[PDB]
Design a protein around this ligand. Structure first.
Ligand code: NI
Ligand code: NI
Ligand code: NI
Lengths: 140, 399, 140, 399, 140, 399
């Protein structure tokens, strides 16, 4: 009933869409994604992203962070993350496996620019890695 | 505890023609109450009844025309040695000479609808074989549509209903049920509306909002009732056959001068199924248009091709047109180029490019020394979407 | 000073004018004027209207009914009836003779459509009769 | 009963120059009151007077210039053993060195107007043979217009008044009454307005409303005062000479983008006479335009003739034009047909049909094989009304 | 720093400006300035204005009068008069000399047209005299 | 007297980085109070201090990053055997990991600005030889701009500042001070705004009011802060170099449809110097644009020449043009006449008249029998002002 190849292609197209949107955020493109910045250690930066449950909780944390950032673009980005997470949840149903489901506010008030730029460049790195490994048979 | 008597005793006629008696529950009682209703129907026969109910309402079967209902209610605590309240003040409810079942029907074009009626003629129920139906006191309804439910109840059945044509401020058909030649002044209101409204949606080029447009040209005539758009979003995709989901939410949309309503959903869920329909909340009920399910990804309007250039190749004289595909969509696109001689009136010729990897085309031109105007538009190769707008005009240099 | 023949001609022109107006009410033209409808028995239908006092009280009752109908058309027809009553008062003054001068709400509220269609088709019939007898020496 | 003191004690100078003292009658007293007014005029001679009046006003003869009036009033029941009220609070009114009779005159162009004056010079009323009148401190009025009312009152009389030419924001002539060469600062205000405003009314083709138009080009200069239309309807017809009826009602008129006011009367009374005029509400009084009486039947604009057809009669070559008379009016009508060759510029020829029963005419045409364009308009045969609009063009077929 | 000849020319230009302004007031030009009018005797009309301190107190009174007239033109004349007063103060500073600094309401209310025309024509006359004597060695 | 404890205890960081403790003086005390402040700095070292001050505030030197200050104050009557109040409620102030000196700088284009910072890394103030400065986390600031104030305080100095380019809603540059490779999220906000706004004023042709226009295109980006025009008027003339007067007043300006602000001065003082500027009242302070002084007398736009006439002189064939100089100014003016053949396109020729007493000029014309169009404009002979508008066209009569 559900054609898995169309869904996989839609996942790649949606990934390319989120990546181009974040590439359009000019201030983030000139910021080193892999550079670690103190205070935002809760943000899931470059750290082998190798399993379905960690990806789900990663996109969940990134979503929770974006909900608090007051930009309309970030709101749209959060909606794209909702559709993408549900697509990975349906893919996990396709492969058969269960998936279960603090200081960020302080930095949002004290350093909104930093919180945004870092969250976005680390998000950009996470999506490039997930994309580069969504074809080498992802497993639960 | 001795509770107080129930208050707010009201009496209404149900759509079925039953007498609904209701009263206010004591919001201060920390325990369930049972009620005893005493009522006296003064018809041609006096009937006294006393019923015990746990609900705050009673249904009395079949309101009798030309009867008077006197009603009192008392309360008692349901659980325990409850003392009864005193009786409420008696309330009187006076029924009417004709009764319709139901009194009004709101339906859509092409449906089947049937009315039942009871005619009291000088305190006497006439035979059902005497009732004749008429439309707007203008024409007798063919007896073929009549049905004898019983010796005293008549029925009229309409099939494949056509939209009611409004006569002045009257947007309904007055259906009369008469005792042979003599009709009565009381009539039934029949409203048949063309609910087949089309809603068209379009997602902006940045895929950040979706604007849906709809015309209420059908309903810019019925006043008193309200009309609003309701929707329900499904996590992914559209069902094979859209349905009216029991759980939905309204979206506030604003009417434009063009006479269309425009409602924008922002932010959007690109891969979520948006089911929308128009709801007509009338005093007599609610009407829903046939639901439609739209996937915003499939109604995207891409931005036009950018960086459009046109150059005449030295010595060869070919029109080299070149462009840059729009940022969105990522799917393979097809392009259409229009080109013409630069003048007051541009004779556009078009060329279609069906290979996604083509960023340029070469055209034969008749005058190597004229300025050509060229524009380009794009569309999804699979046809699942709209055409983009034409690019900004590109001019050739005279060489 | 007052030309009685002129006033008589204005009376005929006003009658035909009101008849054409009521003829423009499409839903009433297809309704049998002489047909009796239960509930509106107080409305003065077809019964030889052969005298100035009965004619006057008939147009007065019809006016009283029309004053309560919330239609603009009914307002103009009632205003034309005011002009018509003044012409009948002037004709009675011309021939020399004195002319002296409830349940409607219930039927208006329960059945406005019926009250309107009947009042108008019966009014049209009364006016058609008056026209056919405004030349056979009308008497007070 | 002890009634209260009268309240609202006011004092005004009448156009004759008398002091009118007025007070509010107690609206709650179910019995007639008599009043006693005590007043003290502190002039060059102090005079105290106490008068008993049954009216709610007193007239004191000849206001003295440079005097002060202090006034109190008390009331008593007229009939019976009435106790007097206490006295009102004393009210003070200070008169001025010159007195004008009247102090201001508001009149229209072409009328005759006359002013009276009193000049107090060091507490002494000078002889009228000394008083001289001046206009706007600009020019001495010829002595021919002066009149010695008495040894102390002078009079100036203007005849065939011409419209006052506005100097800056001043729309009135300042008329001064001077003691020989030396004038005083106090002056009289003279307003002469061209009240000859024309109001034109037109009843719509459906005989449901009448729109009346009027230009306030005369009064778009006087500010502070208000201008509104008043009317009175007579049961039947218009009088031979219209008059200003004492009982009238105002009509709200709306200013249009063209600078004209438009007021629509709906509903209308077709055989009822509508008398209308403009009433000028100035702070100093009211002005009325010459009243006009319009009969709506005589200002009807009929609809154009309908179903106009034009055919060239086979073998005969006559242009047979046919039409249907408009629904209204019922009166016998005359028709006018314009016809011409179908081209970029149509040389229209016209034919007039004066028999109402003619629904067709036959015309000689020069080119049997050209398309003719024809339009028709109508008017009441008696000329009592306007011409209709031209019908929609009818085209001949080339045969 | 301050060119005294320039200041004299600016004084002349401002005086001529006020005189031309009063000349543009059509209703005042036709009123005899020297004609005595009862009621405005408090107005400093034609009376040899022969000293800088007397000119200053006269123009000060004229300013106080103009402040009460609800005309925009009279307001502008009072502002220009303020600049004129400052110019005469600078001229007195140039020549070395110190300069110090009721019934009007009643006449303003009862007879505005006459009070205005008179105040203005007397002001115009005073300025024409001062102008005619601002070259015959003006003294403090 | 035993006074009450001080209230309103607040703690702020000064732009210099000191902790200012403040409290409300008891407005009801008819005698001077002395205070004793007790504070506990919980840093890496606990410090307890108790100071006696006669002022209602205390400055504590150099806020330590990552420390907590707890503060209590008590009061006593200054003169005599005063009993001490009880201690205030303890107030807590929590410092942050990095401290900037000052935390924000609002400056204009072309200025020099420098920030100082202290970085605590695991409860240790690091050495100045490792701190490196960055701009918006994008690029390392050249070490040339760094300055070692001391072994623990770093300084960044920017010279000839360029206007900050807004990135999205961010209108400031985030300047980061980092411990070698590792930066922290806390940054300093640097706002560089182009305060070089030009205000242009123009006096009306009637010399009754002056209108000043300015564009807020610079400031239609900063929200939260307010922008208003301030001015100060000097009794006579403008200074050689305008300055920001300490005493000024605000002027209510209204935004126009073209996006410009208009400030209307009415009435005006022709010979008074109006010094005006734009004030940007931001949450962090106030900014003033370079002040300008305008003398309305020097910005007058005269009215065009009036009564312009053009006649062809009989027998001589000269175009005699004549005019009347505008009412103002009276100073000698120069005139410019344009004349041309009356047509759809007028080839204008111009003649310049430099003598003020010329009310007419005579021009050579090629065709004595054509209608010429003539217009005249004027300007102050000394050039101190603008040119007038062209007069209303004058046409010759063909004679
Ligand atoms: Ni579901
Ligand atoms: Ni009358
Ligand atoms: Ni100064």
């Amino acid at each position: 009933g559900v054609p898995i190849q169309k869904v996989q292609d839609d996942t790649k197209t949606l990934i390319k869409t989120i990546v181009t949107r974040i590439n359009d955020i000019s201030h983030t493109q000139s910021v080193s994604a892999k550079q670690r910045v103190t205070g935002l250690d809760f943000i899931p930066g470059l750290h082998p992203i190798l399993s379905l449950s960690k990806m789900d909780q990663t996109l969940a944390v990134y979503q929770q962070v974006l909900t608090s950032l007051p930009s309309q673009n970030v709101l749209q980005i959060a909606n794209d993350l909702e559709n993408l997470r549900d697509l990975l949840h349906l893919l996990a149903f396709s492969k058969s496996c269960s998936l279960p489901q603090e200081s960020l506010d302080g930095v949002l008030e004290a350093s909104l620019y930093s919180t945004e730029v870092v969250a976005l460049s680390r998000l950009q790195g996470s999506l490039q890695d997930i994309l580069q490994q969504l074809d080498v048979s992802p497993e639960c | 505890v001795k509770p107080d008597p129930p208050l707010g005793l009201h009496m209404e006629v149900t759509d079925d023609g039953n007498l609904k008696i209701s009263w206010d529950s004591q919001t201060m009682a920390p325990f369930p109450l049972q009620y005893q209703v005493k009522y006296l129907e003064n018809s041609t026969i006096v009937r006294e009844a006393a019923e015990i109910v746990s609900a705050t309402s009673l249904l009395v079967d079949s309101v009798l025309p030309g009867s008077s209902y006197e009603v009192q209610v008392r309360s008692k605590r349901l659980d325990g040695s409850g003392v009864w309240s005193d009786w409420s003040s008696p309330q009187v409810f006076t029924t009417q000479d004709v009764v319709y079942f139901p009194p009004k029907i709101l339906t859509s074009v092409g449906s089947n609808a049937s009315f039942h009626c009871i005619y009291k003629n000088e305190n006497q129920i006439i035979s059902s074989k005497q009732i004749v139906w008429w439309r707007n006191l203008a024409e007798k309804i063919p007896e073929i549509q009549y049905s004898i439910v019983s010796d005293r109840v008549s029925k009229v059945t309409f099939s494949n209903l056509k939209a009611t044509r409004p006569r002045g401020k009257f947007t309904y058909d007055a259906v009369y049920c008469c005792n042979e030649q003599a009709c009565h002044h009381r009539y039934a209101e029949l409203y048949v509306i063309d609910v087949n409204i089309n809603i068209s949606c379009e997602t902006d080029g940045y895929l950040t909002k979706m604007t849906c447009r709809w015309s209420p040209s059908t309903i810019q005539s019925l006043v008193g009732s309200t009309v609003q758009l309701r929707y329900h979003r499904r996590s992914l995709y559209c069902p094979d056959s859209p349905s009216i989901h029991p759980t939905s939410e309204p979206k506030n949309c604003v009417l434009q001068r063009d006479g269309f309503y425009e409602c924008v959903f922002q932010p959007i869920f690109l891969l979520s199924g948006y089911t929308m329909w128009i709801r007509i909340n009338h005093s007599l009920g609610s009407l829903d248009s046939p639901p439609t399910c739209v996937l915003p990804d499939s109604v995207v309007k891409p931005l036009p091709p950018s960086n459009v250039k046109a150059e005449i190749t030295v010595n060869t004289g070919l029109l080299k047109v070149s462009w840059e595909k729009p940022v969105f969509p990522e799917n393979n696109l097809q392009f259409q180029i229009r080109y013409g001689l630069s003048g007051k009136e541009i004779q556009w010729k078009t060329h279609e490019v069906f290979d996604a990897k083509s960023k340029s085309a070469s055209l034969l031109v008749s005058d190597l020394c004229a300025v050509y105007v060229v524009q380009v538009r794009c569309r999804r190769l699979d046809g699942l979407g709209y055409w983009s707008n034409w690019s900004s005009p590109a001019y050739t240099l005279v060489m």
